Ligand binder design. Structure first.
Ligand SMILES: *[C@@H]1O[C@H](CO)[C@@H](O[C@@H]2O[C@H](CO)[C@@H](O)[C@H](O)[C@H]2NC(C)=O)[C@H](O)[C@H]1NC(C)=O
Ligand SMILES: CCCCCCCCCCCCCCCC
Ligand SMILES: CCCCCCCCCCCC
Ligand SMILES: CCCCCCCCCCCC
Ligand SMILES: CCCCCCCCCCCC
Ligand SMILES: CCCCCCCCCC
Ligand SMILES: CCCCCCC
Ligand SMILES: CCCCCCC
Ligand SMILES: CCCCCCC
Ligand SMILES: CCCCCCC
Ligand SMILES: CCCCCCC
Ligand SMILES: CCCCCCC
Ligand SMILES: CCCCC
Lengths: 118, 539, 110
């Protein structure tokens, strides 16, 4: 079993920045990807970006290349995502989709409870 | 004769363009497959016994008779003419399975264009499972069923062995490698369009790279920790693996692949623009410099193998035990992946490897493009465009089974059955013919009157008993002991041995075919037939 | 950015009936024999869990009721033994190159 926890509820502030803590435990930390999906309340889903713990690669979708950054830390085995210029329609939840170990390329059920911002 | 200056100058003026895949790629793989150290002494003794005499004999024949690799037998033996067809078939097989290494190397060169090295990127970039990037940067011991990132790259990108479950079921065709081999064939076609190269300019610009890149790779491997374990394993006599191991077959194959004889290439390179120009010395210095470059390549491979074994805390002869041609690429990737300017050195090494393989394979087709000119000078000597294109198309259509997903399943088979018994028996037939059918004293008189200095007494005793008996013993040891091929977690079935024996027979059965075809042409009794056929016709 | 949208929009709940979901991937081709496609299941008030990966194998801790097939462009989903407890929304995700993007999603309601 691999535990995975996230931060708590936060408030949306116009033009400010927030930090979402996401620490993994019970598995190889700096060996697989760590996705960051967005789920709007009631609406569909969308992708933001991905970062490999170890400063290897840092990819993005294209709609959040500058509005969302990704930071890894192999010491405490935590992954942060510092937002920027929060808007009114950005009030949603974010997960920590741990990618598979390679060839398969899936999320092995280790989805956090999600941090809601309002 | 020691530190006089002339010798070191002659060696420095020869080390530039005296390196081929037979001594930088074929020698390390064979030496590490049969165990390092225990192969150097058999290799060098088989060389000094039967590789230099045959080389000198082929050079003398090509320099005296002034004929092609097939038309030279019209003055030697009218019956032993099928050896030319055997040489042509062997060269076709080579150019079929030898260009796949160039295809893989050029694909590596293309993939090395990215500033980020794909070798050290197995973190699900495209797809890679069960890999360990950090060797010592994580302080974690090596776990069971773990493969290096470069090994996973070579096993999943350039040679997708996961698509084919085995040799019995080969997958489709890789377009990314098909286009690579097509570009390689387009390049090789635009270089033999004329067919003359004796004082060219490209030789210098392709020879100036190795003299520096080999030295920089050697010092990089020397300044790498853990290399002391690999050097000791490379200089181990290991007398226990020499008595009754039957390893001399691989040594002889490596010798005949690196030196040149046995493929019909010395005759073509000797029957043009040369006559009585410092004989009995050029062949010796070429063999010496080839052996020196081979030893340098073996050392630069083993100094990296030592580091690879020390970083895993396991035996040196176990890291790559079920590995075929993957020994060179993985080693070079792991060696270049620890350099400051790693991408530039990698692209330079890949480009020089491509140009070296091209300059090496230019000699393979050179002995077949000129073989039909001296045999059919009335139909093929006037076109010069309808034959090279035909042989290129035939090679492309014959090198397609080695381009499937089961690449190493075919290259490994043709690496011990297409040149193992075939080249050996061809060299044996040639040697025994030149010895008994033509006459040792006759050839000695010819070389004495064309050179002005009779060869030594040691050379005369070689071609009569040394080479033929050793080659016969090697052939008997091969026939009375079928090899056992084994790739990564794979065992070849029983029909693989039959397929290899059939492959190693079609390239030799043509000689008895021509023998039976020659006697049925001339009339008369068998005695008169052999009497009139053994003696050569009027020139 | 290889976009991928599902063709259906909504279906009905019925015990023991066939219902397939297709994913439009016309601008996509199989890379190395493994179909880089995934299937998720998101219940109201629950994070989405893995349902089927690679369009051929079964997910972790998923019953044998779900099964998928297909290769290349079109992919289907066999949910023949469907009950009321499977009234969730399923998505479609492709993972070829740097193009990871989810789909629209399909719901079921009688
Ligand atoms: C890396 O790990 C994987 C699984 O985590 C290994 O895959 C399996 O290997 C065992 C034996 O080692 C086989 O019995 C299984 O059938 C394999 N799984 C599948 C799906 O085929 C793999 O061997 C390990 N080593 C590598 C990839 O080099
Ligand atoms: C790989 C090492 C090659 C070394 C080659 C040395 C050749 C020495 C030839 C000596 C021939 C002596 C003939 C004496 C005749 C009376
Ligand atoms: C994406 C650009 C690929 C360019 C490939 C160039 C290959 C040059 C090979 C030269 C061989 C001598
Ligand atoms: C992307 C992998 C390398 C692709 C190289 C294509 C080269 C095409 C050459 C066509 C010659 C006719
Ligand atoms: C001792 C093993 C003998 C194997 C013989 C295989 C068949 C050789 C002749 C093939 C003719 C095409
Ligand atoms: C650690 C021992 C290194 C020995 C290097 C020898 C190089 C010989 C070049 C001819
Ligand atoms: C089962 C197919 C074997 C093909 C061998 C080609 C050399
Ligand atoms: C044809 C020019 C070759 C220069 C060295 C390339 C590696
Ligand atoms: C000019 C076309 C030659 C085709 C040869 C096929 C063997
Ligand atoms: C698709 C055919 C590839 C070559 C098969 C040779 C037996
Ligand atoms: C044209 C070639 C004649 C000899 C064929 C031997 C197989
Ligand atoms: C090898 C030739 C066999 C037949 C000989 C007939 C004289
Ligand atoms: C037997 C081969 C002749 C040249 C094509």
């Amino acid at each position: 079993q691999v535990q995975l926890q996230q931060s708590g509820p936060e408030l949306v502030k116009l033009g400010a920045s927030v930090r979402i803590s996401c620490k993994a435990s019970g598995y190889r930390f700096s060996y697989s990807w760590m996705n960051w999906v967005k789920q709007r309340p009631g609406k569909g889903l969308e992708w933001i970006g991905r970062i490999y713990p170890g400063d290897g690669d840092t990819k993005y979708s294209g709609k959040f290349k500058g509005k969302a950054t990704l930071t890894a830390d192999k010491s405490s085995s935590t992954v942060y995502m510092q937002l920027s210029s929060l808007t009114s329609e950005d009030s949603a939840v974010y997960f920590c989709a741990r990618s598979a170990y390679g060839s398969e390329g899936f999320a092995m059920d280790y989805w956090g409870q999600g941090t809601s911002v309002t | 004769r020691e530190t006089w200056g002339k010798k070191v100058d002659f060696l420095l003026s020869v080390i530039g363009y005296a390196v081929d895949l037979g001594n930088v790629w074929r020698f390390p793989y064979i030496c590490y497959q049969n165990g390092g150290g225990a192969f150097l002494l058999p290799y060098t003794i088989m060389a000094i016994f039967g590789g230099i005499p045959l080389f000198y004999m082929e050079l003398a024949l090509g320099q005296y008779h002034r004929n092609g690799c097939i038309s030279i037998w019209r003055k030697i033996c009218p019956i032993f003419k099928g050896i030319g067809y055997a040489i042509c078939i062997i060269a076709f097989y080579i150019a079929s399975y030898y260009n796949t290494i160039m295809a893989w190397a050029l694909y590596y060169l293309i993939s090395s264009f990215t500033d980020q090295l794909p070798w050290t990127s197995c973190k699900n970039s495209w797809n890679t499972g069960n890999c360990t990037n950090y060797f010592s940067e994580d302080n974690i011991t090596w776990t069971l069923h773990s493969t290096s990132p470069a090994e996973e790259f070579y096993t999943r990108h350039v040679l997708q062995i996961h698509r084919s479950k085995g040799l019995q079921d080969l997958g489709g065709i890789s377009w990314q490698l098909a286009l690579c081999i097509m570009l390689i064939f387009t390049v090789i076609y635009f270089s033999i369009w004329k067919g003359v190269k004796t004082s060219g300019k490209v030789v210098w610009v392709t020879a100036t790279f190795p003299y520096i890149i080999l030295s920089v790779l050697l010092v990089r491997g020397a300044t790498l920790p853990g290399a002391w374990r690999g050097v000791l394993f490379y200089l181990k006599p290991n007398w226990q693996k020499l008595l009754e191991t039957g390893v001399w077959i691989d040594a002889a194959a490596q010798i005949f692949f690196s030196l040149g004889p046995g493929f019909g290439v010395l005759l073509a390179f000797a029957s043009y623009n040369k006559f009585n120009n410092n004989c009995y010395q050029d062949a010796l210095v070429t063999s010496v410099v080839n052996c020196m470059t081979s030893f340098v390549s073996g050392f630069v491979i083993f100094t990296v193998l030592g580091y690879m074994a020390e970083m895993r805390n396991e035996d040196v002869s176990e890291v790559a035990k079920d590995a075929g041609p993957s020994l060179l690429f993985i080693t070079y990737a792991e060696a270049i992946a620890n350099m400051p300017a790693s991408t530039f050195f990698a692209i330079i090494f890949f480009l020089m490897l491509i140009t070296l393989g091209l300059d090496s394979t230019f000699a393979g087709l050179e002995g077949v493009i000129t073989a039909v000119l001296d045999e059919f000078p009335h139909v093929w000597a006037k076109r010069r465009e309808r034959f090279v294109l035909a042989v290129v198309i035939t090679c492309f259509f014959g090198s397609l089974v080695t381009l499937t997903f089961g690449g190493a399943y075919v290259v490994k088979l043709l690496e011990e059955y297409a040149t193992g018994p075939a080249v050996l028996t061809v060299a044996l037939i040639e040697a025994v013919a030149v010895s008994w059918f033509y006459g040792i004293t006759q050839f000695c008189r010819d070389v004495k009157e064309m050179l002005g200095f009779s060869p030594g007494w040691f050379w005369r005793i070689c071609w009569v008993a040394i080479s033929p008996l050793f080659l016969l013993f090697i052939i008997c040891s091969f026939l009375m002991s079928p090899p056992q091929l084994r790739l990564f977690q794979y065992n070849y079935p029983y029909w693989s041995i039959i397929l290899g024996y059939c492959i190693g027979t079609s390239s030799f059965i043509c000689i008895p075919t021509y023998i039976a075809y020659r006697l049925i042409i001339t009339p008369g009794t068998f005695k008169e037939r052999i009497i009139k056929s053994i003696t050569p016709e009027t020139p | 950015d290889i976009v991928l949208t599902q063709s259906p929009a909504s279906l009905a709940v019925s015990l023991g009936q066939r219902a397939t979901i297709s994913c439009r991937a016309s601008e996509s081709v199989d890379n190395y024999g493994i179909s880089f496609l995934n299937w998720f299941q998101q219940k109201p008030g629950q994070p989405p869990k893995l349902l089927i990966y690679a369009a051929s194998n079964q997910g972790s801790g998923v019953p044998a009721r779900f099964s998928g097939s297909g290769s290349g462009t079109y992919f289907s989903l066999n949910i023949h033994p469907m009950e009321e407890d499977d009234t969730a929304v399923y998505f479609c995700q492709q993972t070829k190159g740097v193009s990871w993007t989810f789909g629209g999603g399909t719901k079921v309601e009688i």
